[PDB]
Ligand binder design. Structure first.
Ligand SMILES: CO[C@H]1[C@@H](O)[C@H](O)[C@H](OC[C@@]23C[C@@H]4[C@H](C)CC[C@H]4[C@@]4(C=O)C[C@@H]2C[C@H](C(C)C)[C@@]34C(=O)O)O[C@@H]1C
Ligand SMILES: Nc1nc2c(ncn2[C@@H]2O[C@H](COP(=O)(O)OP(=O)(O)OP(=O)(O)O)[C@@H](O)[C@H]2O)c(=O)[nH]1
Ligand SMILES: [Mg+2]
Ligand SMILES: [Mg+2]
Ligand SMILES: [Mg+2]
Ligand SMILES: [Zn+2]
Lengths: 191, 52, 129, 197, 158, 129, 259
RNA sequence: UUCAUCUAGACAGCCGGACGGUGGCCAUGGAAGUCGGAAUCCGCUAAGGAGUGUGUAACAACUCACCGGCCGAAUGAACUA
């Protein structure tokens, strides 16, 4: 309804620096550096006191101001990703056939190899996007852990593992086999 | 057989879903309108039928 | 024949008496099958010490074909039935209407026996006076 | 709506200006059955009034003009708490107040204050219930027609919430790490607040 | 020799069956038939109405003691000339029973009831009669309730 | 294995798979002859549930004889007694009616005026004067 | 078809050693036994011939799949044996299936056996009348055997309890009942501890996995991973014999010959 | 457009309780809030329906109305074109 001025607040902690070009956001923190292209959103960034960013939309519609709040979420996800990181915990679900998941190398590409899913002789391969760390954690049975700075990369690669292990030609309510994200949090505990 | 917790986890994605009455689309369990354009985002949804 | 055909003629079906040895968990499947086949649950019992129930019910012979396979299917093979003729139960529906529940089974009987399809009315065998 | 609230304001006024002391008893995880028992114990001796913290603070603030003394109450009216108006010896009141400890059943997905260890002693339940024991890996040997756990097995750790399968067996065995009581917060008495203990 | 507890709803005056004993009285083994005739002795006072039967089964010394219950007592207060369950289904339970029994019935209810005043317990037990469908003092039980709340049927606070 | 009441050989078995093997043995080695299988014909009993609202009449072919009668629903307990031997056709009238009247509520005069039992001479159908 | 529809009698002759005839709590004389073996049908549709078989026999070989555990028919067929007062002996079959399909690493196989015996013993406990009492089946006492029928190999805890006396000189009467359940050899200390105790870090393996399942696991691992340089190292250590052409056999077929 | 909740704290969110008479009456082979007809009560109450659903053969066990705890300013519903 053409809000004159709609505003959102981006809180910047002490140890991170945010360098913002026209719509190129570069967040540099203790854990790494993230970059995002926002030239499709037509918003305005302005720094207030070197730990606070204001992003505003002027004379924006319902959809325009709705995506303004999305920009705040995207930037805060960048900032929290270089301070605390992201870790997504996935458990293996199988009734009869244990799912053999490990790390395999082909031309130095860091593929996640999946074997024996529902007894299939097909070998599923999930590429690891750059920035995502893969570790199998002991003392938790059938656990793969994906860690990284950007939630977009961490979550999507976890989703790729989940989607590659979808059951076909069966009642999915009974054949519940797959790899599902059991936890979504940060690398740093209780931060 | 599956552990109860892992079966609950798998059900959260495979069974704990809604279904559109008009296009059979699989929707989130708390959705009020279907995301599909073919049905015109109709509000006629049902819970996904539980096994047995 | 005239006396019979005016005193609201009806048919009687044979009904089986079935006692089924089923455990604690699968006793529910018995009732599901029984409600499909008009069965009447008579009494429940527990064998002392074991979880095996003992359900006695009246299952009509007409609706008793394939009963154990569906009963096995609903109880996962845990139900063990024993089946024997008990008595005769009268069908409440008229066996003269061809579209009635009792009228269809008698209609099939008439056809396979070489008799006529429609049954001779009470006007026959009755001399008007 | 403000009408119905206003008798509660009035009822709170009546109670506070009749009895001499009260408690700020902390009501958490306390069942409806538990509260009735406690109140039933206190018949005549004292009454218990708990309500919407917001109004309770609000009601007092309007009363402060006539009754300044109660001003100290406000910073302690936080969380689910009730006011036990009394005109009886504080010592016995506190004992009866924190008296109704009840071993609450083992709920599923419920945080475990401590570790949950199950013992190798006999339980007396018929071998039918063996399904529950097997589910949680707990070894069990049948003796004298009764389920006797073979070896000590910890089902639930400390902190980690008690899962559904874990809880199920605990309820069967009547095991529970948490018992809830109407713990207290503060004791206002005639114009003075002090630690209950 | 420990005091186990069990509860039943056996109809008054009439014997019970192993069908609802063996699932509980089977493991301990109290000779179900023996238990059933004990139940009849318990229910003997309460002929013709379902009543709870306490079992303090301290190694086969089953109590056979009827646990009181508002419903049964209200029915037992109508004096209900013996019901023939067989003859007709859906028999009624009506009458005109006065205040006094409600005072009496409340007396063994106040013990467990949380209705501190007898007036509270009486309208509780009388409230059960409203569900039953009988009458009290020729008037609607809820009319008696609102009559009590208006201070004209004042309860003896004994 | 036995012979039904509808004139059909009825082989019985534990289940569908057990019966399939038994029939396969029957068709191949035991009998040795090609045979066909169908569900058994269930026999029923015709009965009445009223009192023949108006009097049934029939006239003889020569028009000289007329019969007026009615039909009635004999009670279930009386039907069991005939089949279970409590009421014997061989027994003596006005002596077998002592059991039949006091234990089944009927009046002695109609009980004494019994002509036959049907069918087969001992069935549960009655004819009264 | 692949199923059993009848109950056919077969007679078996069995010679044994003197040392295990002494290990018999029954009045006996000689060193040879004659077996009258009936192969009952598993289907419930043929559950009457097993009743005929049970009446004509006195013992029951209860074969149980480790994969499927205790099924409905194992429930039923054992119930009728207990009704006839037949003493059952339980053998856990298809252990090979669990070791190529389920890939149970160290403890899951032991727990499946533990759960299986508990579920089996529940059946005999509630359906036994008070004439024997000790009719429970229990592997450490030697009433339960383990193996894979399809491959033609099986073992009992008693068999391993005697196999180690010939090589270690340790007691067998108190190791026959020791090699099952919560029992840990505790290396580096030489003490048969009765609990995990955390092993002061790195909780240790039990005697069942360490002494019984470990050698067969090692043979499975080597053969299925084609460690030809490592096969004979165990085989001579496992006191077997060689033939002219069975040595020229690859994985998935060595199990045929070696076990 | 209309009607509602709302700093005496609204909606949403997360968490706690969700009782006693009482297994209300009658039926049912079993029916305990949750296959049914009818009765839609009282007490304690901040609050709890003779019950919102799942569920059990029947119990049980979760769940929801209902009331609270945390945050603090708007929100909800039904219609119109
Ligand atoms: C225990 O052994 C028994 C029972 O299983 C059962 O009574 C059944 O008996 C067969 C029937 C007996 C019924 C009564 C005699 C009256 C009607 C008879 C039947 C129907 O016509 C019902 C069962 C099933 C048979 C028809 C459907 C073919 C009967 C028959 O013999 O005709 O099979 C054997 C003989
Ligand atoms: N992998 C594997 N399969 C087995 C094992 N034991 C039995 N089987 C399979 O089980 C099937 C049935 O076993 P059989 O001995 O042939 O016959 P059965 O068990 O008597 O079956 P019925 O005759 O129908 O009762 C066989 O075809 C095998 O394939 C085993 O130890 N390992
Ligand atoms: Mg298919
Ligand atoms: Mg076979
Ligand atoms: Mg129900
Ligand atoms: Zn749709």
């Amino acid at each position: 309804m053409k809000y004159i001025q709609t505003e959102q607040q981006i809180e910047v902690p002490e140890g991170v620096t945010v360098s913002i070009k026209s719509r190129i956001v570069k967040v540099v923190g203790p854990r790494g550096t993230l970059t995002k292209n926002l030239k499709h959103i037509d918003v305005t960034f302005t720094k207030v006191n070197n730990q606070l960013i204001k992003v505003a939309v002027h004379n924006g519609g319902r959809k325009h101001v709705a995506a303004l709040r999305t920009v705040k979420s995207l930037v805060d996800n960048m900032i929290t990703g270089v301070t605390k990181g992201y870790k997504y915990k996935m458990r293996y679900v199988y009734a009869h056939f244990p799912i053999n998941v490990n790390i395999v190398e082909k031309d130095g590409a860091k593929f996640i190899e999946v074997r024996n899913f529902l007894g299939d002789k097909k070998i599923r391969n999930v590429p690891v996007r750059d920035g995502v760390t893969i570790e199998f954690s002991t003392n938790v049975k059938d656990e793969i852990v994906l860690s990284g700075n950007s939630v977009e990369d961490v979550s999507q690669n976890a989703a790729d593992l989940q989607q590659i292990c979808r059951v076909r030609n069966k009642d999915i309510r009974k054949f519940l086999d797959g790899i599902y994200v059991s936890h979504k949090g940060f690398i740093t505990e209780d931060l | 057989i599956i552990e109860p917790s892992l079966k609950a986890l798998a059900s959260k994605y495979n069974c704990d879903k809604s279904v559109c009455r008009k296009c059979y689309a699989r929707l989130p369990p708390r959705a009020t309108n279907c995301r599909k354009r073919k049905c015109g985002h109709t509000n006629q949804l049902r819970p996904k039928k539980k096994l047995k | 024949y005239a006396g019979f055909l005016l005193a609201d003629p009806k048919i009687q079906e044979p009904v089986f008496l079935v006692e089924i040895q089923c455990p604690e968990q699968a006793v529910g499947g018995i009732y599901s099958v029984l409600n499909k086949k008009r069965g009447q649950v008579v009494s429940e019992e527990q064998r002392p010490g074991t979880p095996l129930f003992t359900v006695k019910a009246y299952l009509p012979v007409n609706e008793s074909f394939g009963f154990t396979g569906e009963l096995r299917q609903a109880t996962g093979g845990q139900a063990f039935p024993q089946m024997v003729f008990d008595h005769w139960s009268t069908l409440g529906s008229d066996p003269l209407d061809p579209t009635s529940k009792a009228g269809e089974i008698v209609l099939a009987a008439r056809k396979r026996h070489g008799m006529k399809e429609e049954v001779p009315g009470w006007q026959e065998y009755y001399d008007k006076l | 709506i403000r009408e119905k609230k206003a008798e509660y304001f009035a009822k709170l006024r009546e109670y506070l200006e009749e009895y001499k002391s009260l408690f700020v008893v902390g009501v958490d995880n306390v069942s409806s059955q538990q509260m009735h028992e406690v109140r039933k114990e206190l018949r005549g001796r004292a009454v218990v009034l708990m309500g919407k913290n917001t109004m309770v603070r609000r009601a007092i603030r309007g009363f402060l003009s006539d009754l300044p003394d109660f001003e100290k109450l406000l910073p302690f009216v936080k969380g689910n708490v009730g006011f036990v108006f009394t005109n009886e010896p504080l010592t016995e009141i506190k004992n009866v107040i924190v008296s109704n400890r009840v071993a609450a059943p083992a709920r599923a997905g419920a945080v475990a204050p401590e570790d949950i260890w199950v013992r190798a002693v006999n339980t007396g339940m018929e071998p039918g219930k063996t399904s529950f024991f097997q589910a949680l890996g707990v070894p069990t040997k049948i003796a004298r027609g009764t389920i006797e756990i073979v070896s000590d097995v910890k089902v639930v750790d400390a902190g980690n919430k008690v899962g559904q399968s874990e809880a199920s067996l605990l309820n069967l065995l009547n095991i529970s790490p948490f018992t809830f009581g109407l713990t207290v917060v503060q004791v206002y008495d005639n114009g003075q607040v002090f630690p209950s203990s | 020799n420990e005091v186990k507890y069990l509860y039943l709803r056996a109809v008054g005056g009439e014997v019970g069956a192993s069908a609802a004993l063996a699932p509980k009285i089977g493991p301990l083994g109290l000779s179900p038939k023996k238990v059933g005739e004990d139940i009849a002795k318990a229910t003997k006072e309460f002929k013709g109405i379902k009543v709870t039967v306490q079992l303090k089964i301290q190694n086969r010394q089953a109590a056979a003691s009827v646990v009181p219950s508002a419903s049964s007592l209200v029915i037992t207060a109508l004096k209900e000339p013996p019901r023939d369950r067989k003859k007709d289904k859906n028999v009624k339970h009506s009458g005109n029973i006065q205040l006094d029994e409600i005072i009496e019935i409340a007396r063994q209810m106040r013990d467990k009831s949380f209705g501190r005043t007898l007036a509270s317990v009486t309208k509780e037990i009388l409230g059960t009669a409203q569900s039953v469908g009988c009458r009290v003092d020729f008037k609607n039980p809820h009319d008696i309730i609102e009559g009590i709340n208006a201070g004209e049927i004042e309860i003896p606070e004994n | 294995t036995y012979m039904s009441e509808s004139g059909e050989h009825i082989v019985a078995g534990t289940g569908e798979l057990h019966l399939e093997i038994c029939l396969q043995d029957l068709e191949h080695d035991h009998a040795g002859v090609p045979l066909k299988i169908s569900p058994p014909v269930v026999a029923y009993r015709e009965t009445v549930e009223s009192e023949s609202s108006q009097t049934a009449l029939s006239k003889s072919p020569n028009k000289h004889n007329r019969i007026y009668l009615k039909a009635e629903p004999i009670d279930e307990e009386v039907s069991l007694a005939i089949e279970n031997g409590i009421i014997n056709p061989r027994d003596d009238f006005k002596a077998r009616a002592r059991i039949m009247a006091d234990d089944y509520g009927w009046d002695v005069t109609d009980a004494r005026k019994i002509w036959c039992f049907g069918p087969d001479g001992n069935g549960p159908n009655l004819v009264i004067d | 078809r692949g199923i059993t529809i009848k109950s056919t009698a077969i007679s078996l002759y069995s010679e044994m050693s003197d040392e295990d005839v002494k290990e018999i709590k029954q009045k006996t004389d000689g060193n040879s036994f004659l077996i009258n073996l009936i192969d009952s049908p598993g289907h419930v549709d043929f559950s009457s011939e097993v009743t005929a078989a049970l009446r004509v026999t006195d013992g029951a070989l209860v074969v149980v799949d480790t994969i499927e555990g205790v099924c409905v028919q194992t429930e039923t067929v054992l119930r009728q044996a207990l009704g006839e007062r037949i003493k059952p002996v339980v053998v856990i079959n298809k252990v090979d299936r669990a070791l190529l399909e389920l890939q149970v690493s160290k403890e899951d196989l032991y727990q499946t056996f533990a759960r299986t015996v508990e579920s089996v013993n529940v059946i005999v406990s509630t359906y036994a009348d008070e004439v024997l009492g000790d009719v429970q089946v229990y592997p450490a006492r030697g009433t339960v055997a383990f193996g894979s029928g399809l491959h033609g190999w099986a073992f009992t805890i008693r068999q391993f309890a005697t196999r180690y006396a010939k090589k270690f000189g340790v007691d067998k009467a108190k190791m026959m009942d020791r090699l099952w359940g919560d029992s840990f050899f505790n290396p580096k200390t030489k003490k048969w501890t009765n609990k995990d105790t955390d092993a002061e870090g790195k909780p240790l393996e039990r005697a069942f996995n360490m002494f019984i399942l470990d050698p067969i696991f090692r043979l499975f691992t080597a053969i299925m991973n084609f460690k030809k340089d490592e096969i004979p190292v165990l085989l001579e250590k496992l006191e077997i014999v060689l033939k002219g052409d069975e040595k020229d056999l690859e994985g998935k077929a060595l199990l045929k010959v070696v076990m």
